[PDB]
Design a protein around this motif. Structure first.
Motif, PDB file in Angstrom:
ATOM      1  N   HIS A   1      -7.977  -0.646 -13.898  1.00 45.40           N
ATOM      2  CA  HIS A   1      -7.535   0.553 -13.203  1.00 45.40           C
ATOM      3  C   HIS A   1      -6.115   0.939 -13.642  1.00 45.40           C
ATOM      4  CE1 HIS A   1      -6.570   3.299  -9.965  1.00 45.40           C
ATOM      5  NE2 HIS A   1      -5.511   2.546  -9.715  1.00 45.40           N
ATOM      6  N   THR A   2      -5.225  -0.052 -13.766  1.00 45.69           N
ATOM      7  CA  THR A   2      -3.929   0.108 -14.413  1.00 45.69           C
ATOM      8  C   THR A   2      -3.668  -1.140 -15.245  1.00 45.69           C
ATOM      9  OG1 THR A   2      -2.798  -0.910 -12.558  1.00 45.69           O
ATOM     10  CG2 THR A   2      -2.937   1.548 -12.582  1.00 45.69           C
TER      11      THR A   2
ATOM     12  N   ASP B   1      -0.848   4.191  -2.977  1.00 49.82           N
ATOM     13  CA  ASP B   1      -1.720   3.569  -1.979  1.00 49.82           C
ATOM     14  C   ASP B   1      -1.418   2.096  -1.758  1.00 49.82           C
ATOM     15  OD1 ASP B   1      -2.932   3.210  -4.543  1.00 49.82           O
ATOM     16  OD2 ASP B   1      -4.958   3.555  -3.823  1.00 49.82           O
TER      17      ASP B   1
ATOM     18  N   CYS C   1      -7.725  -1.664  -6.255  1.00 49.27           N
ATOM     19  CA  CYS C   1      -8.321  -0.459  -6.833  1.00 49.27           C
ATOM     20  C   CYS C   1      -9.116  -0.747  -8.100  1.00 49.27           C
ATOM     21  CB  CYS C   1      -7.247   0.583  -7.116  1.00 49.27           C
ATOM     22  SG  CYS C   1      -6.284   1.057  -5.629  1.00 49.27           S
TER      23      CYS C   1
ATOM     24  N   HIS D   1      -0.446  -3.152  -7.229  1.00 46.05           N
ATOM     25  CA  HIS D   1       0.015  -2.444  -8.427  1.00 46.05           C
ATOM     26  C   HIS D   1       0.901  -1.286  -7.989  1.00 46.05           C
ATOM     27  CE1 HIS D   1      -3.606  -0.074  -7.669  1.00 46.05           C
ATOM     28  NE2 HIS D   1      -3.016   0.915  -8.314  1.00 46.05           N
TER      29      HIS D   1
ATOM     30  N   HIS E   1       1.248   1.969  -7.509  1.00 43.63           N
ATOM     31  CA  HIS E   1       0.813   3.292  -7.095  1.00 43.63           C
ATOM     32  C   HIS E   1       1.008   3.419  -5.592  1.00 43.63           C
ATOM     33  CE1 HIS E   1      -2.075   4.346 -10.691  1.00 43.63           C
ATOM     34  NE2 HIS E   1      -0.823   4.672 -10.939  1.00 43.63           N
TER      35      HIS E   1
HETATM   36 ZN   LIG Z   1      -3.779   2.925  -8.603  1.00 38.47          ZN
END
Ligand SMILES: [Zn+2]
Ligand SMILES: CC1(C)S[C@H]([C@H](NC(=O)COc2ccccc2)C(=O)O)N[C@H]1C(=O)O
Ligand SMILES: [Zn+2]
Length: 240
Positions: free
Chosen positions: A159-160, A94, A178, A90, A92
């Motif tokens: 999470h998203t 990380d 995540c 996704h 982000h």
């Molecule tokens: Zn994330």
């Protein structure tokens, strides 16, 4: 390396520059990179490396380009086979912070179309190819050409809204990114971009997509049992 968040070092972990690698199966390794927080300490993030015959496949970048280049250097040293492609789970830092290192290396990169659409807004570089998904979450095969054992599944928003997951065919491993927290976790982590209504169903959908995976790998804890899935869903039940 003693992270504030994420699993600690244990027997079987190989330190390589600033990263840690752990063999999970004959052909699967977990990569771990650390982002130091002013005032808080290091946060570990995990992804995967999979050998598929004469090539290597990567799931997730590290937090940064330099860390991601170290992943590629570890692959060169320990496996010495070309990386065919990477899938990132996704938009982000990380999971996608090191896209430029993959591109500089000439590695084909894939992400959920929505992740690629969100990447500019999230301070990320989009993958070069977009995955799309059916109404039941399974990837459209023509968008995931030659993915070998990587079985990509979009479980729904959690999470998203763009989070995806990856089963490793031919093994008992599935990767929740995540979305999934470990079985002992006290919280669901950063819910700032989360869909609290749909999270529980999305976590359970991941479990049902890979019903025989007994080793659940996740972004910020050591590989766990399926209780990571059921506990994450139970915690998410409380958000509705
Ligand atoms: Zn994330
Ligand atoms: C481990 C988390 C709680 S933070 C991570 C993600 N943050 C970043 O990648 C970049 O921002 C920062 C990264 C780390 C610390 C501070 C800022 C996010 O916002 O979801 N995923 C979370 C999770 O897995 O719960
Ligand atoms: Zn995370």
């Amino acid at each position: 390396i003693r992270p504030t968040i994420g699993q600690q070092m244990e027997t079987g972990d190989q330190r390589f520059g600033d990263l840690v690698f752990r063999q999970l199966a004959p052909n699967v390794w977990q990569h771990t990179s650390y982002l130091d927080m002013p005032g808080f300490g290091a946060v570990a993030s995990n992804g995967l490396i999979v050998r598929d015959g004469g090539r290597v496949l990567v799931v997730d970048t590290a937090w940064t380009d330099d860390q991601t280049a170290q992943i590629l250097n570890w692959i060169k040293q320990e496996i010495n086979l070309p990386v065919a492609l990477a899938v990132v789970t996704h938009a982000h830092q990380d999971k996608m912070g090191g896209m430029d290192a993959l591109h500089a290396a000439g590695i084909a990169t894939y992400a959920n179309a929505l992740s690629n659409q969100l990447a500019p807004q999230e301070g990320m570089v989009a993958a070069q190819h977009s995955l799309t998904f059916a109404a039941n979450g399974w990837v459209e095969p023509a968008t995931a050409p030659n993915f070998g054992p990587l079985k990509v599944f979009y479980p729904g928003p959690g999470h998203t809204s763009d989070n995806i997951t990856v089963g490793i065919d031919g093994t008992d491993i599935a990767f929740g990114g995540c979305l999934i927290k470990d079985s002992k976790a006290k919280s669901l982590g950063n819910l700032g971009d989360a869909d609290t209504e749909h999270y529980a169903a999305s976590a359970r959908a991941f479990g049902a997509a890979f019903p025989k995976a007994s080793m659940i790998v996740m972004s910020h804890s050591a590989p766990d049992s399926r209780a990571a899935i059921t506990h994450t869903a139970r915690m998410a039940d409380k958000l509705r």
